[PDB]
Amino acid sequence: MLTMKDIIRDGHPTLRQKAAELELPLTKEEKETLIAMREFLVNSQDEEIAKRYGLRSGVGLAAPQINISKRMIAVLIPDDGSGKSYDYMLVNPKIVSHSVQEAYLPTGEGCLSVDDNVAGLVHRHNRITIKAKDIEGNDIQLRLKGYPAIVFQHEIDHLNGVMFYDHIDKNHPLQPHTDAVEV
């Protein structure tokens, strides 16, 4: 299983690279790592297993974060009230369209790869459409709003060498953009 030992940390060069598109089908090895990434999320969200193996809690992970510079991500966002949950392993995900309307988490964002907490609002598109491939090379189109959309954008940024804190206003970190919605 993956652990925090596997997660590379801010300053590591792989995080600042652009990750390579995968050829399809995936190798037995690539499928294995994408399942393991999902398994990390699951494990990190279990109280017991996370205490035991020293796991930070996560809802998303991009392959660059385990030092594999390939365009695959995993997102595990549990039910949390509404009956909606997000359990997705995506290959070559792409944002094909979005809202003009920005949104933001009012406490900022975190990142498994960033050891410190950073304060600052990270403005993002409130709605997105994503086209990607699943683990078996079938076609996936996702329409996301709000928290799920922020999460996927965060992980997609990882595939382009962008970190959440790059989007934070150095002067006015906690100033929302006008008409940006709080999530």
Ligand X SMILES: O=C(CSC(=O)[C@H](Cc1ccccc1)CC(F)(F)F)c1ccccc1
Q: How many residues bind Ni ion (CB under 5 A)?
A: 2
Q: Was 154 annotated as part of a binding site?
A: yes
Q: Compute the least distance from the CB of residue 158 to ligand X, in Å.
A: 7
Q: Compute the least distance from the CB of residue 50 to Ni ion, in Å.
A: 17
Distance between CA atoms of 73 and 64, rounded to whole angstroms? 9
SS3 91: strand
Residue from 76, 111, 159, 168 binding Ni ion (CB under 5 A): 111
- Is 155 assigned a catalytic role? yes
If contact means CB under 5 to 8 A according to the sort of partner, which of ligand X, Ni ion, none does residue 19 touch? none
Binning the chain into helix, strand and coil, the percentages to the nearest 5 are: 25, 25, 50
Q: Was 111 annotated as part of a binding site?
A: yes
Q: Compute the least distance from the CB of residue 76 to Ni ion, in Å.
A: 14
Q: Is 23 in the site for Ni ion (CB under 5 A)?
A: no
Task: Kindly report the backbone phi and psi dihedral angles of residue 126, in degrees, each rounded to the nearest multiple of 5, phi listed first.
Answer: -65, -40
Maximum Cα interatomic distance, the chain, rounded to a whole number of Å: 47
SS3 72: strand
Q: What is the pattern of x (binds ligand X, CB under 6 A) and - over residues 63-102?
A: --x-------------------------------------
Whose Cβ is closer to Ni ion: residue 111's or residue 144's?
111
Q: Which of residues 122-151 bind Ni ion (CB under 5 A)?
A: none
Strands of the sheet containing 72-77, edge to edge, are 60-62, 72-77, 86-98, 127-133, 139-145
Tokens read off for 98: 């979005």
Distance between CA atoms of 7 and 69, rounded to whole angstroms? 13
Interface with ligand X by CB under 6 A: which residues?
45, 57-61, 65, 105, 109-113, 150-151, 154-155
Interface with Ni ion by CB under 5 A: which residues?
111, 169
